[PDB]
Design a protein around this motif. Structure first.
Motif, PDB file in Angstrom:
ATOM      1  N   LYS A  71     -12.585   1.376   3.366  1.00 17.39           N
ATOM      2  CA  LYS A  71     -11.742   0.186   3.307  1.00 17.39           C
ATOM      3  C   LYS A  71     -11.529  -0.274   1.871  1.00 17.39           C
ATOM      4  O   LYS A  71     -10.434  -0.726   1.512  1.00 17.39           O
ATOM      5  N   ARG A  74      -9.031   2.154   0.177  1.00 24.29           N
ATOM      6  CA  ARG A  74      -7.653   1.967   0.615  1.00 24.29           C
ATOM      7  C   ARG A  74      -7.064   0.650   0.130  1.00 24.29           C
ATOM      8  O   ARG A  74      -5.834   0.543  -0.022  1.00 24.29           O
ATOM      9  N   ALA A  75      -7.914  -0.338  -0.174  1.00 20.02           N
ATOM     10  CA  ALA A  75      -7.430  -1.604  -0.716  1.00 20.02           C
ATOM     11  C   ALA A  75      -7.238  -1.582  -2.228  1.00 20.02           C
ATOM     12  O   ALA A  75      -6.683  -2.536  -2.785  1.00 20.02           O
ATOM     13  N   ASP A  76      -7.673  -0.524  -2.899  1.00 14.48           N
ATOM     14  CA  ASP A  76      -7.555  -0.410  -4.345  1.00 14.48           C
ATOM     15  C   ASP A  76      -6.211   0.201  -4.707  1.00 14.48           C
ATOM     16  O   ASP A  76      -5.800   1.219  -4.124  1.00 14.48           O
ATOM     17  N   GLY A  77      -5.544  -0.410  -5.688  1.00 18.10           N
ATOM     18  CA  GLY A  77      -4.218   0.069  -6.055  1.00 18.10           C
ATOM     19  C   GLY A  77      -4.231   1.523  -6.500  1.00 18.10           C
ATOM     20  O   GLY A  77      -3.474   2.354  -5.991  1.00 18.10           O
ATOM     21  N   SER A  80      -5.614   3.996  -3.657  1.00 20.74           N
ATOM     22  CA  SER A  80      -5.159   3.750  -2.293  1.00 20.74           C
ATOM     23  C   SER A  80      -4.952   5.036  -1.497  1.00 20.74           C
ATOM     24  O   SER A  80      -5.166   5.059  -0.281  1.00 20.74           O
ATOM     25  N   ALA A  81      -4.485   6.099  -2.144  1.00 16.21           N
ATOM     26  CA  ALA A  81      -4.050   7.301  -1.449  1.00 16.21           C
ATOM     27  C   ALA A  81      -5.078   8.424  -1.501  1.00 16.21           C
ATOM     28  O   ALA A  81      -4.782   9.542  -1.071  1.00 16.21           O
ATOM     29  N   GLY A 103      -7.832   3.983   7.632  1.00 17.78           N
ATOM     30  CA  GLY A 103      -7.159   4.909   6.747  1.00 17.78           C
ATOM     31  C   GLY A 103      -7.849   6.229   6.495  1.00 17.78           C
ATOM     32  O   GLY A 103      -7.471   6.926   5.545  1.00 17.78           O
TER      33      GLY A 103
END
Ligand SMILES: [Mg+2]
Length: 130
Positions: A71, A74-77, A80-81, A103
């Motif tokens: 989590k 996925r919340a980190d800019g 994220s991917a 994710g």
């Protein structure tokens, strides 16, 4: 088993032996650019250095478990991917669904072989278009 053999992996597991197992299977497949972390906070600290291309994470770790690590990724800019492959000792419908909603790129049950890890990595690469 994609062609980018220098993709930098982070192997996260609170068991040193499990980290060594994954590290050795990755080497067998041709992936030698590997670092290790012992829980979620350790992993984020190393991920902040940048350059990582794939995370393989234990689901059950102290302090910060695999779901919370995923989590946070996925919340980190910037991260994220990042592909995240979750590793568990036992497949449970509810764990898999929760991981997918958070994710997770994939999910594998241990112990697993090189062929099985190769299968999980390819499927993730193909799903994400890599
Ligand atoms: Mg564990």
């Amino acid at each position: 088993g994609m062609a980018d053999k220098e993709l930098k992996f982070l192997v996260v597991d609170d068991f040193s032996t499990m980290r060594r197992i994954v590290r050795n299977l990755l080497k067998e497949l041709g992936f030698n650019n590997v670092e290790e972390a012992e829980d979620g906070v350790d992993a984020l600290n190393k991920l902040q250095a940048g350059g990582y291309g794939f995370v393989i994470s234990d689901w059950n770790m102290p302090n910060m478990d695999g779901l919370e690590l995923l989590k946070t990724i996925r919340a980190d800019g910037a991260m994220s991917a990042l592909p995240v492959l979750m590793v568990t000792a036992e497949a449970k419908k509810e764990n898999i669904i929760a991981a997918a909603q958070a994710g997770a790129s994939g999910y594998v049950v241990k112990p697993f072989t090189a062929a099985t890890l190769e299968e999980k990595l390819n499927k993730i690469f193909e799903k994400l278009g890599m």
